[PDB]
Amino acid sequence: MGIEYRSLHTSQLTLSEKEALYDLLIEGFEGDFSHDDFAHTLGGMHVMAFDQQKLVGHVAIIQRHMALDNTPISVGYVEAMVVEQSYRRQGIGRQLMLQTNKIIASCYQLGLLSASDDGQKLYHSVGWQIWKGKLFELKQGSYIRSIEEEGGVMGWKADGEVDFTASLYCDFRGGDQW
Amino acid sequence: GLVPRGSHMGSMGIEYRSLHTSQLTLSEKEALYDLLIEGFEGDFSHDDFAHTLGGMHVMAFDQQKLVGHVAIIQRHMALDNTPISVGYVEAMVVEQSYRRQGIGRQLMLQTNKIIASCYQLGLLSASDDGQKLYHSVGWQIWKGKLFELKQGSYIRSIEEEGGVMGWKADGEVDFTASLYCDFRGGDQW
Ligand SMILES: CN[C@@H]1[C@@H](O)[C@@H](O[C@@H]2[C@@H](O)[C@H](O[C@H]3O[C@H](CN)CC[C@H]3NC(C)=O)[C@@H](N)C[C@H]2N)OC[C@]1(C)O
Ligand SMILES: CN[C@@H]1[C@@H](O)[C@@H](O[C@@H]2[C@@H](O)[C@H](O[C@H]3O[C@H](CN)CC[C@H]3NC(C)=O)[C@@H](N)C[C@H]2N)OC[C@]1(C)O
């Protein structure tokens, strides 16, 4: 412990934090990180962990506009969790998601994310549970169903009640829509 | 208790603060809502207040009084069939007694800064009485066709064409291409 946490919007980042963020994401994902993945990281809030001026952890929360069963839903979508390897064994990830949960709770109706191989445990340990409904994405104007993502997407409710069996229609982006 | 949030500058006795929605108190949320209705003379709907939150706010205060606001929403659209990241400008308003003092200009200058650092294109929907201010800081009429998701299908937004304005974020965007916005409650533009 001894890690200072900062919640800042992309518009508030230093050049130092951006350059440190980019190096951390590449080390953590090492070629699994597209230029599209980097694009999805930007535009919203970043939760960052610092060990005495040098960045050790990061998670981002971006606003997405989806449809939950023909009803508009304001989603805080979680992107690019990464913790430096030497710092992965200190609960930094859990602290990251708890600030994430607060931001989602004070801004959006629903938090969404697409779990990775390393972690479907950490997200579950702070209240995230697998999304059970069908998932759809925009593909050249019309909506295709994202079968390859169902079971990999998890949600988190904040002060409401959302049918985790309903269909979700995500907004359009580059690369992986989820 | 209360700590410094985001960022602050001052211009001619007016303090301007850029805050994310997650960085505002419930009291500040209600002060803003009070500002929006009085400033729009009742035209401001609850769907429009929902469209205001979730992103950044620039807020102008005459001393302790909230006298100006603008919001920058992140929206995910398509240009033709290319993905484009949009900072959508919402709920621009200055209190009636505080017009003619350069507050809307300063609000938009901060808006341009936020957009330039975060998104590829700024977009807004302006009134015919409001196009003059955004033109004064580089915004141009969008020339392409506009589309909106209605019940899962894209329909042409004929009534909004000519009323949407854009501001390129240090790049190149063809303002004659068509725009396919994201789904939301209330008015899509
Ligand atoms: C079906 N089995 C899965 C397999 O489809 C795949 O899932 C991918 C998921 O990981 C990825 O998002 C994660 O990777 C992005 C770029 N690499 C950065 C954000 C990161 N999540 C954030 C919260 O850290 C999604 N954008 C796309 C998913 N297809 O890889 C994991 C998997 C379990 O094998
Ligand atoms: C085609 N002639 C226009 C006419 O369609 C209409 O345009 C509307 C536009 O104004 C409105 O957005 C403005 O009002 C929102 C809620 N009222 C708050 C945000 C505010 N823009 C923010 C930046 O101040 C859009 N959301 C919907 C548009 N239909 O009214 C104006 C008009 C000139 O008559």
UniProtKB/Swiss-Prot annotation, chain A:
The keyword Transmembrane does not apply. Residues 8-171 form the N-acetyltransferase domain. It holds the Pfam family Acetyltransf_9. GO terms for biological process: response to antibiotic. Keywords: Acyltransferase, Antibiotic resistance, Transferase. Belongs to the AAC(2')-I acetyltransferase family. Catalyzes the coenzyme A-dependent acetylation of the 2' hydroxyl or amino group of a broad spectrum of aminoglycosides. It confers resistance to aminoglycosides. NCBIfam families: AAC_2p_Ia. This is Aminoglycoside 2'-N-acetyltransferase.
